[PDB]
Amino acid sequence: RRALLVAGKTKINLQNCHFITGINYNGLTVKQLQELRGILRENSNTKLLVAKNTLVFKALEGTKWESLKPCMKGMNAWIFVQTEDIPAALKTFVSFQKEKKLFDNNLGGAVFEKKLYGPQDYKVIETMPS
Amino acid sequence: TRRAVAGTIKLTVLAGKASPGPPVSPALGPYRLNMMAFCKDFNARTQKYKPDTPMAVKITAYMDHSFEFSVKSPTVSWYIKKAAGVDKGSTRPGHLTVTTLSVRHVYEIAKVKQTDPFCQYMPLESICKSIIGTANSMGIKIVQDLE
Amino acid sequence: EAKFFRFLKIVGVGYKARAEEAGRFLYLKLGYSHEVELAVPPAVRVFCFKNNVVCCTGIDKDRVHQFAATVRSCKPPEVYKGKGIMYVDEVVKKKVGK
Amino acid sequence: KKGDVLYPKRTKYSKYRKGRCSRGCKPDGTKLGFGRYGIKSCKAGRLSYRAIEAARRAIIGHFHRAMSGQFRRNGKIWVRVFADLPITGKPTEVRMGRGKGNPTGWIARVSTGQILFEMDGVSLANARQAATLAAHKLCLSTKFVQWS
Amino acid sequence: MLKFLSKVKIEFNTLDPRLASCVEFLAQCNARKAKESNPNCQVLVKRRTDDQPPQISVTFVNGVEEAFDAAATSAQSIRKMILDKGQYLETEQMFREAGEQWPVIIPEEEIHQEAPGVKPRK
Amino acid sequence: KSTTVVGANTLKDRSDPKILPDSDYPDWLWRLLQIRPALSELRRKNVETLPYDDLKRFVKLDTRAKIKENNSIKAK
Amino acid sequence: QLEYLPGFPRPDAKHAETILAVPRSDSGKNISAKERKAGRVPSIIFEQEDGQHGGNKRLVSVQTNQIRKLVTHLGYSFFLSRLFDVEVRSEIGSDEVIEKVRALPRSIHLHSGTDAPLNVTFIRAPPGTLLKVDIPLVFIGDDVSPGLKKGASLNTIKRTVKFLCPAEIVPPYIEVDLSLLDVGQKLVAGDLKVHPALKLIRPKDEPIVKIAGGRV
Ligand SMILES: [Mg+2]
Secondary structure, eight states: OHHHHHHHHHHHHTSSOOEEEEEOOTTOOHHHHHHHHHHHHHSSSEEEEOOOHHHHHHHTTTSSOOTTTTSOOSSOEEEEEOSSOHHHHHHHHHHHHHHHTOOSSOEEEEESSSOEEOTTGGGTTTTOOO | OOSOOOEEEEEEEETTOOOSSSSSSTTTGGGTOOSSHHHHHHHTTTTSBOSSOEEEEEEEEOTTOOOOOEEEOOOHHHHHHHTTSOOOOOSSTTTSOOOEEOSHHHHHHHHHHTTSTTOSSOOHHHHHHHHHHHHTTTTOEEOSOOO | OOOEEEEEEEESTTOEEEEOSTTSEEEEEOSSSSOEEEEOOTTEEEEEETTTEEEEEESOHHHHHHHHHHHHTTSOOOTTTOOEEEESSOOOOOOOOO | OOSSSOOOSOOSOSOOOOOOOSOOBOTTOOOOSSOSEEEEESSOEEEEHHHHHHHHHHHHHHHHHHSOGGGTTTOEEEEOOOOOEEEEEOOSSOOSOSSOOEEEEEEEEEOBTOEEEEEESSOHHHHHHHHHHHTTSOSSOEEEEEOO | OOSSEEEEEEEEETTSTTOHHHHHHHHHHTSHHHHTTOSSOEEEEEEESSOOOOEEEEEETTSOEEEEOTTTSOHHHHHHHHHHHHHHHHHHHHHHHTTOOSSOOOOTTTTTSOOOOOOOBO | OOSBOSSOOOBSSSOOOBOOOTTSSOGGGGGTTSOOOOHHHHSSSOGGGOOHHHHHHHHHHHHHHHHHHHHHHSOO | OOSOOTTSOOOOSSSOOEEEEEEOOOOSHHHHHHHHHHTEEEEEEEOSSOSSSTTSOEEEEEEHHHHHHHHHHHOHHHHTTSOEEEEEESSTTOOOEEEEEEEEEEEEEEOTTTOOEEEEEEEEOOTTOEEEEEEEEEEEOTTTOHHHHTTOEEEEOOSEEEEEEEGGGOOSOEEEEOTTOOTTOEEEGGGOOOOTTOEESSOSOOEEEEEEOOOO
16 A cells, blocks of 8 residues: 555656655654755755665566666665756755755765766766756 | 753744743743743733744753743734633534634734744645644634624 | 673672683672672683672683583572662563562 | 342242252353354353343453543443342251251353443443453353343 | 774775675764774775775774775674674783783693582681 | 624634625535445455546545454453 | 446455365264364255155265355355355365356354354355345445434344345345435335346335434
């Protein structure tokens, strides 16, 4: 039943998605998780979901997001973005990190156009606008 | 932060009357907390509000006597009883009825409750149905339109 | 060369321990008029430290644990103030005395 | 009925023969007649009216404490076994034959598969535990039966 | 769990699929119940794109360095073996502070010798 | 009385608000007391054809029911 | 028109097993005890057309584990208001199938003390045959009832209803809705929502369930 819950929760979120990331939520509380979800839900066009890694593993099979497979271990909060503006999508985490002083929770892994950029590699792509 | 959180204790104080003895006596003295600086910080912000209003203050006590508090709006029981009528709850709620409110008071109370410092992102349907659930819990009736 | 180790802590007003001969003889003072002498068996030696702590050190796990329980059984902890010999990691739960 | 302790108000004859009770079964199977749960017997024997009253009191007192308020009497009990055989008895320090003794009490003949109690209007767990409590007052071996 | 360590160095590759044990040890060592137990203890996270395998290299208070196979052993097995070495180090230090020689040597022939039961005596 | 709320707004410069007619208010206010269905109907239906809010209510009432049925049985 | 209408329950496909039997050569307590010791339940398959002269009967024996599993999983009354496939072969593991037929369990005998099955009865019900079937009731909507909300208690007068049913559309159970009953009222046997081709054997002015007021 929860398998169908998160299958629907990813089937709705993959309808307009163009890149996918996963954040290590070690040490984040419920209120700060809600604040991250709020910042990235009003100020952008993104959505946050914490899900079973094997269930996202099985629910992304047969899709162009099949390259992700190494980057699904440990504590994963999956962020699905239904929009295209990656500078405003990725600078919000910079503002969040520099404001609330959270170095223990970083961006590990992302998928854009059949490629897994390094966390160093999807740093310059937020500089280029549109 | 890095400090070992001891307790989180809440209280209700009327607006403007932060005299640290009738409600700020043993309630804050049970946890070794100070009574001067917290009252100064409390009276340094409720200058723009109507007095004799039961403002909700949650204070996170610490072992180094540091105050890190946020100010909450007055209680939804107060908001749903004072905007309705008599402040007396039923002997048997859900079956015995006191007052009646249709659709509008709960909706604007939800709009005011959205101003809670960690309710920036909860939807108005969520807040309205939460207040409906509170309204079920003291025995007041809700209808589509009182006439 | 020793491998198996066990530690004991003594709690009490005037309760004392002392090793006598090369770590082979153990002597104890538990509030009686006399003292308590125990002969540490082979494959085990005993040592005493400056926190009222007795160490049972040895090479045979059976003899080490049996002798540590033997030293403990001379005086178990009481439930009203915790006085006696106990294990270091052991928690003693007290109760109030009417 | 007679309130708690159940025996007939009057009978045709004062003294009855002893009879036999160690045999007898329900030759067609048994089903519940009024309730959803019930207690039936697995063996055949005798039960006294004091034991039946003690079992009924145990069930109603368990429902009394488990469920209160308006559901306190939502549990319904049917007692389907009735004690209508008087038993007699001679006192101490008496010889063998000068007639038949005075009656002392009443018993009920219970067969194999006879339903003693029936319960409705409660939870399944409350019914099972009330049957467990009631079977400790009866000398016979009982089973919990459920409607299906 | 964090009483006996001085510096920990975690190193791994982020796009290589064997990082589960090392990030689980990161979760074990960066808890709220951990860092309050040793405020002076240091953590060192390093990430690299190249193919150096994921390793946990720790040091203790008494200058002993230990490298562990973080690729094939789990974080909980690492947590058990660090304490297994740590309590031995503590026992060594506790013996050494009191004036006893370390390591203490017992003749390995008394295992064959018979021993009677220990009855306490006056 | 029935045309103004009392004691709602607490800003000293302003006043308590009024009761607007059904012209400024959006649609979802009058949907508040519809019969959101209970576990007697949602259990027997097909989960695969259920909409999002209904299946969310299904799993939430299922979790509440299993918590209550644990707490009522295991209690002594 | 011999099909279940929409809005009606249907027999489940989980409990749609086939019942396997082997022939039995005699009647009586001797061979009955021998079959029960060997681990089989005695049975007979018969038809309706000739009540005298037997009725084209065949004496068989079915498997105790299968029959006990069916009765435990379905319930006693639900097993008796549902059709089954019966396959009679000459031996267990043999392929010489003697008779495959669609039959109704007319009765099952359970021991009054141990509840082991002692006898199963099967009656041949091909399409076009009329039966007297006892259908169980299922009571729904007890959370919506205003009378039950007000603290009244439920008085279930009857649990099963006897009907005259053609074989094809025999209902497994009858759903009775209690959403709109307050304190004081009862439902009679004429309020049951059934197929129009089913005839009620009992008179329609027979109470089924009444909601009676609580002890104020
Ligand atoms: Mg015969």
